[PDB]
Design a binder for this molecule. Structure first.
Ligand SMILES: [Ca+2]
Ligand SMILES: [Ca+2]
Ligand SMILES: [Mg+2]
Lengths: 127, 127, 127
């Protein structure tokens, strides 16, 4: 087991690590749309969706793996009315990374997220 | 890793795959109560719980595994007040498949689900 | 695979097991803050958080592993306004167990939890 840490994902400010490498599998903590360079969250959902995805990417890359190694993700959103926009950003993100296939996924609307963000994404990648 | 696909589960009409086979473990995407042949969702929760479970079963079976190979399920519901009905159907489904033991499970009521369905279920199975 | 059972975690009263041991990984069912000795749930969120964590620990210990082997946990809460208290208890718990590092984590506010509890936690541990 190895702790994953990267300055390209929001700093772990609390009792948790950004992600963990189990050897054959990598698990990331749920990533909120905080910009790692400023500590701020963009106002619009499209930008938040892309920021969370970029954060997931940073944690996965810290293990030496790539976006294409992601096999499952869970997407928690604050409002499914924005699902069209989130899916568009989400699909485009994987397309832009030239992945062989999209990962398996679960998506649900929650009552609230940390810092009142509109989305949180956790992922599983395999080596 | 291998992509899982079956006509017995709702077609992936978004940026995701039905499930993934990691060799030792199989992970399904969250399955909603859509009838794969008609694209329709039954009106009552008992029927929806049944359809989602059948969908999960289809994805797991696509890997060559069975319902008895499921080790963990996460059940997201729209209403814990229907938990009596959901719990009945859930237990019945596993009993009908003559499993040695029920899987580990987490159940929570979410704020909303894709397509305004009443339940979404994701599963982990092992070979 | 092996079924995990312990009298130190709430009794599985339904179609599920407390946890499962897959050999290299242990998965616990979501643990609610029920005190296994009395069957009661404490009123305050701090007590509930510690009770759920102790229940998770009990399931993990039933496999032969320890708190230090926990690598990922998902924390579902009924109210994020109680998150300062939950993080406090959560960090204190791992600190008291002298873990080398905190595990990866995802935290979201749900609409409702079984028995109307304020927190539910599920964990993954590795051997
Ligand atoms: Ca496009
Ligand atoms: Ca709602
Ligand atoms: Mg109701």
């Amino acid at each position: 087991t190895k702790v994953l840490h990267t300055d390209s994902a929001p700093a772990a400010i609390g009792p948790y690590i950004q992600g963990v490498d189990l050897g054959n599998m990598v698990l990331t903590s749920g990533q909120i749309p905080v910009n790692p360079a400023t500590g701020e969250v963009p106002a619009d959902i499209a930008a938040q969706a892309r920021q969370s995805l970029d954060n997931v990417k940073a944690v996965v890359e810290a293990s030496g793996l790539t976006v294409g190694d992601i096999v499952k993700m869970t997407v928690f959103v604050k409002d499914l009315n924005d699902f069209g926009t989130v899916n568009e950003v989400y699909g485009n993100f994987f397309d832009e990374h030239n992945v062989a296939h999209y990962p398996a996924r679960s998506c649900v609307e929650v009552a609230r997220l940390p810092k009142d963000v509109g989305i949180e994404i956790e992922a599983i990648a395999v080596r």
